[PDB]
Design an enzyme around this catalytic site. Structure first.
Site, mmCIF file in Angstrom:
data_model
loop_
_atom_site.group_PDB
_atom_site.id
_atom_site.type_symbol
_atom_site.label_atom_id
_atom_site.label_comp_id
_atom_site.label_asym_id
_atom_site.label_seq_id
_atom_site.Cartn_x
_atom_site.Cartn_y
_atom_site.Cartn_z
ATOM 1 N N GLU A 1 1.412 0.491 -5.194
ATOM 2 C CA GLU A 1 0.974 1.730 -5.770
ATOM 3 C C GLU A 1 2.162 2.661 -5.790
ATOM 4 O O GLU A 1 2.544 3.203 -4.778
ATOM 5 C CB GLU A 1 -0.138 2.381 -5.007
ATOM 6 C CG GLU A 1 -1.478 1.749 -5.283
ATOM 7 C CD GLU A 1 -1.860 0.682 -4.296
ATOM 8 O OE1 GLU A 1 -2.964 0.156 -4.388
ATOM 9 O OE2 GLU A 1 -1.069 0.409 -3.432
ATOM 10 N N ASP B 1 0.845 -1.186 0.000
ATOM 11 C CA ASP B 1 0.000 0.000 0.000
ATOM 12 C C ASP B 1 0.884 1.240 0.000
ATOM 13 O O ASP B 1 1.890 1.297 0.709
ATOM 14 C CB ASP B 1 -0.925 -0.010 1.227
ATOM 15 C CG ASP B 1 -1.799 1.230 1.320
ATOM 16 O OD1 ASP B 1 -2.651 1.416 0.415
ATOM 17 O OD2 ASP B 1 -1.639 1.999 2.305
#
Ligand code: MG
Ligand code: MG
Ligand code: MG
Ligand code: MG
Ligand code: MG
Length: 1052
Positions: free
Chosen positions: A675, A646
């Site tokens: 990400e 994340d």
């Protein structure tokens, strides 16, 4: 040595004391006090107003621009205001200004119960209110902010010391550094001399490399300073104070202790011969290991042994401590409170926990009692070794409650639990088994480490399937709300929400009104709220007390891998902690080594929150180690196959790669991705971004094909949600009534889509919308090079994910009013086709195959079972179940109300057709290695596009993949080449590109007949292919005796 002291001015008395119906506010002005010179405070003024919170002011000036509320008077210490009141109780709102600029960012609230004489003092830039100018004076000429940085053993970086004759590091073991009653700074100190920042320091801390540098004597007892408060003080040559600030010490902590500490292993390390506990706490004054009984009574408290080289504390005992509960009793200075704090903290390296993580627990994860039968021989069902292997990855991003909370065919006591995956006869598990059989290869799990934001004590929780009376019992907000009349009804919460649907609208969003209260005490959260990084979440276990959850988690992993045949990916959230500081229940790391594991503002020392919450500092050596050690347990002890970081962009590239190097030694085929957007941390280190990870083998989500096919971007709200149509929802070719998208703009989106279907490679050569020869890096993506990858395995394509709106809700936002329901189902499939038939790794949200809706909720992390429902009985897709939460989506209510009812809500027929479409696409991707070449050079040698340039038919994506003699060897003995035709348009389209070839429609699609995405496709005699509207055709050149001519890439 000159004594550092306060100004030779006397400590001020009060200028005036408030009389009846008055308050007095003093401004202590440091500039005016240090300056010899008289001060004209005519630009100082108060902005004063009453509100519901503070209302004691009498006739305050209304206009913000009115600066005429100037000081009642002034003296050498500053101005003061006498303020008329209506009463002497309550509080007043004050904004202290110069012109219309705030001198204090905090909007002050002077409480007449905190200060009963209503005579207060403040300082520019300080949010505190003082009872006397004397207190404010000592604070204004005391310690403020935290903008000195003790970055290695002998280097202090601090702007406050620049040009000052006296720069010192004052320290106090048990108290705060402060001047005594003689106004003299009498604590011990180290003297520092100016210096130039070293190359080592500027490399480590490039964002500090412009700070004035000061040098410590290279023999200072650093351990003695680091055990308490240290304060940097600068003074003039007569010893008069210049400024004093707190000191950030993570740098010197790493330079002093990190290498020695990195060489050790941490946690409650249980092994036959005994147990060794170890915790890193290089600033703590004392650490005791507190051992607790199963009923949480103290049975021992052990002073631990500090290791001088590392700053770690250890304690070695016998194997009888297996299963014992424990915490670390810390005595440690916290710079946020400036106190030597005393508290018990769970183990940051905890591997087992009590209910709700209150105590950690000694465990040996190797224990066979904590494993399902056959666990040690559990193998990874899908290969991940080569790039070709990796490219087959087809991910189903899922959540423990989203999977089973609504499934009445899962045993009630397993709904929302890890063990729901073992309920082989349930609708949900049967659906996942068929998804796997058709070519979904990986289950990605939303946070199943120990999250903070669900209460694991079942008695404190109420879910919507339970009586409204239980909800009232556990939630005083509900019991005090407009819904309190349901308290003694005999309805369940879900029964109430259901009845609220009919009268729910943008003008009465009562479904979300109740649900927002329910969210506070239910079992539901995405879980991006890390409590302990290396323990399974407790609420997903049937028994959250102790080691029970470990076996249940492993039983689930085994079920997914052995029985469902899918690899497992874990979401990890190392970029932040749930809380920091010395107080919060869930602050773990920042209680044990204060100010080390969080990233701090360079001036104030406040923990930053670029993430949602308390930003962590993976650039710091011992947090990098914590991360790698944590990943090692998930890899070895829990047999996780890959990890999604994340917000990976808040990590240094160097740290993610070091972690990968370490984990590859344990599992050589592990896959990392995350990400990787461009973040604001690039001034501190090279970030782990899409651009910086090129060629490294670390994957990143691509926002390129995502935006192009969905339409718009993550910053859209209001009308843009409908105007910004995508390739999947008819940009250009089926405009809605609001949009102004041009044909040129629609063709730019198709260029990004084709590029993404070829793996979003930087060097892939295509013909753009204008007929120009372009490398992927030359296709613009909102000002950035669009193609960024070296290999397609570095790219994760997707059109839906847990965050932001579901694909179906976006199609509902964007689709033309005249696109009927069956067309919108085909839009969903066509959008997913660009992912599933592309060369990048394929990623998708749980339930896209069921047209999943969240009732337009954009950010559903705390929207409960209601809005996150996935119905595996196939009755509907959860669309139109009430307006979404008004706090975040209220500004979308207008556009929602206009679009919501354009067509019917999907039912069983549409969901069954969508699942067929979806499995058709995954089966096609799985069927041939040409869809998943893995290597970028191989993609460049084999992948091309037709229907490109200025004369293209808009929305028709035509990709070719060569298996013929010019590409090299035949990778697929059945075919010499493949054509992927996605006709994202409401017309039939005819292709002549393949005239004269022996092209055939794939047997998989033919077998589906009129249920195929290729239903109605025609492959004429002459080789021309016609596709109907909103269709997808995979065609192939059958391979004969020898490898044939194939579909060679055109020279460009
Ligand atoms: Mg007072
Ligand atoms: Mg938890
Ligand atoms: Mg909740
Ligand atoms: Mg910054
Ligand atoms: Mg072949």
């Amino acid at each position: 040595d000159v004594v550092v002291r306060l100004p030779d001015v006397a400590v001020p008395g009060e200028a005036v004391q408030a009389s009846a119906r008055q308050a007095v506010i003093h401004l202590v002005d440091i500039a005016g006090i240090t300056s010899s010179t008289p001060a004209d405070y005519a630009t100082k003024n108060l902005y004063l107003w009453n509100n519901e919170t503070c209302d004691a002011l009498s006739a305050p000036v209304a206009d913000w621009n009115d600066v005429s509320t100037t000081p009642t008077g002034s003296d050498k210490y500053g101005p003061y205001w006498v303020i008329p009141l209506t009463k002497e109780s309550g509080c007043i709102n004050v904004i202290v200004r110069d012109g219309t600029n705030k001198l204090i960012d905090s909007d002050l609230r002077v409480s007449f119960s905190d200060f009963t004489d209503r005579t207060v003092s403040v300082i520019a830039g300080n949010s505190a209110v003082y009872d006397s100018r004397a207190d404010a004076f000592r604070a204004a000429f005391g310690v403020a902010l935290a903008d000195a940085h003790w970055v290695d053993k002998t280097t202090l970086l601090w702007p406050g010391g620049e040009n000052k004759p006296i720069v010192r590091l004052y320290y106090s073991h048990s108290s705060k550094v402060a001047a005594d009653s003689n106004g003299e700074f009498s604590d011990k100190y180290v003297k520092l001399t100016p210096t130039t920042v070293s190359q080592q320091v500027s490399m480590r801390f490039p964002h500090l490399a412009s700070y004035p540098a000061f040098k410590l004597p290279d023999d200072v007892n650093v351990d003695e300073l680091l055990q308490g408060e240290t304060v940097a003080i600068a003074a003039e040559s007569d010893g008069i104070l210049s400024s004093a600030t707190q000191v950030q010490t993570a740098g010197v902590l790493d330079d002093t202790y990190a290498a020695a500490a990195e060489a050790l292993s941490y946690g409650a390390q249980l092994t036959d011969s005994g147990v060794t506990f170890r915790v890193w706490a290089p600033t703590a004054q004392q650490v005791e290991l507190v051992i607790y009984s199963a009923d949480k009574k103290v049975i021992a408290s052990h002073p631990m042994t500090r290791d001088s080289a590392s700053g770690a504390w250890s304690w070695q005992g016998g194997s009888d401590l297996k299963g014992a509960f424990y915490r670390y009793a810390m005595t440690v200075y916290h710079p946020q409170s400036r106190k030597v704090e005393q508290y018990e903290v769970t183990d940051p390296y905890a591997h087992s926990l009590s209910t709700n993580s209150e105590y950690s627990q000694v465990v040996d994860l190797n224990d066979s009692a904590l494993k399902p039968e056959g666990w040690d021989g559990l193998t990874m069902p899908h290969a991940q070794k080569t790039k070709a292997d990796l490219a087959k990855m087809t991910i189903h991003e899922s959540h423990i409650r989203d999977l089973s909370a609504w499934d009445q065919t899962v045993p009630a006591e397993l709904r929302g639990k890890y063990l729901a995956l073992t309920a082989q006869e349930s609708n949900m598990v049967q659906h996942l088994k068929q998804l796997s059989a058709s070519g979904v290869t990986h289950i990605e799990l939303l946070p199943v480490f120990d999250l903070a934001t669900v209460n694991e004590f079942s008695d404190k929780v109420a879910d919507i399937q339970q009586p409204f009376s239980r909800l009232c019992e556990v939630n005083s907000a509900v019991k005090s709300s407009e819904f309190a009349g349901y308290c003694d009804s005999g309805s369940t919460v879900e029964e109430v929400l259901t009845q609220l649907k009919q009268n729910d609208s943008k003008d009465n969003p009562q479904v979300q009104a109740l649900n927002t209260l329910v969210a506070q005490t239910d079992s539901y959260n995405w879980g991006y709220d890390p409590f302990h990084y290396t323990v399974p979440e407790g609420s997903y276990a049937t028994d959250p007390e102790g080691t029970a959850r470990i076996k249940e988690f492993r039983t689930m992993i085994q079920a997914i891998k052995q029985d469902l045949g899918m690899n497992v990916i874990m979401d990890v959230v190392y970029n932040h902690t749930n809380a920091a500081g010395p107080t919060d229940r869930t602050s773990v790391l920042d209680k044990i080594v204060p100010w080390y594991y969080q990233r701090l503002n360079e001036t104030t020392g406040s923990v930053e929150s670029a993430t949602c919450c308390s930003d962590s500092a993976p650039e710091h050596r011992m947090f990098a180690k914590l991360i790698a050690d944590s990943l090692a347990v998930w890899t070895t002890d829990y047999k996780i196959d890959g990890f999604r970081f994340d917000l990976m962009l808040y990590h240094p590239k160097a740290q993610i790669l070091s972690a990968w190097e370490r984990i590859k030694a344990l599992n050589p085929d592990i896959y990392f991705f995350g990400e990787g957007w461009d973040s604001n941390q690039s001034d501190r280190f090279e970030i782990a971004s899409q651009i910086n990870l090129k060629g490294t083998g670390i994957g990143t989500f691509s926002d390129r094909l995502r935006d192009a096919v969905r339409g718009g971007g993550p910053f859209d709200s209001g009308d843009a949600l409908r105007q910004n149509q995508g390739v999947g929802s008819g940009a250009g070719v089926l405009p809605n009534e609001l949009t102004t998208l041009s044909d040129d703009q629609a063709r730019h989106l198709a260029d990004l889509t084709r590029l993404g279907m070829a793996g979003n490679l930087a060097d892939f050569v295509l013909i753009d919308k204008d007929g120009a020869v372009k490398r992927g890096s030359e296709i613009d993506y909102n000002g950035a090079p669009g193609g960024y990858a070296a290999d397609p395995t570095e790219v994760v394509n997707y059109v839906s994910k847990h965050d932001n709106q579901t694909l179906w809700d976006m199609i509902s936002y964007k689709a033309a009013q005249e696109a009927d329901l069956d067309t919108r189902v085909r839009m969903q499939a066509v959008s997913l086709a660009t992912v599933m038939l592309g060369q990048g790794i394929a990623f998708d949200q749980q339930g896209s195959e069921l047209l999943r809706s969240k009732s337009f909720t954009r950010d559903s992390y705390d929207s409960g079972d209601w809005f996150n429902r996935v119905d595996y009985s196939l009755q509907d897709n959860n669309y139109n179940v009430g307006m979404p939460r008004s706090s975040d989506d209220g500004s979308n209510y207008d556009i929602i109300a206009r679009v919501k009812d354009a067509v019917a809500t999907p039912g069983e027929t549409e969901l069954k057709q969508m699942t067929a479409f979806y499995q058709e696409l995954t089966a096609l991707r799985k069927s041939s290695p040409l869809f998943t070449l893995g290597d970028g050079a191989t993609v460049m040698k084999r992948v091309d596009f037709r229907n490109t340039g200025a004369d293209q038919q808009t929305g028709l994506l035509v990709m070719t993949i060569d298996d013929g003699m010019q590409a090299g060897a035949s990778l697929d003995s059945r075919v010499d080449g493949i054509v992927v035709a996605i006709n994202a348009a409401p017309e039939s389209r005819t292709l002549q590109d393949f005239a004269g070839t022996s092209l055939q429609l794939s047997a998989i699609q033919q077998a589906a007949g009129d249920r195929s995405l290729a239903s109605g496709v025609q492959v004429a005699a002459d080789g021309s292919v016609t596709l109907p509207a909103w269709s997808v055709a995979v065609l192939e050149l059958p391979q004969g005796e020898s490898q044939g001519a194939g579909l060679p890439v055109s020279s460009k």
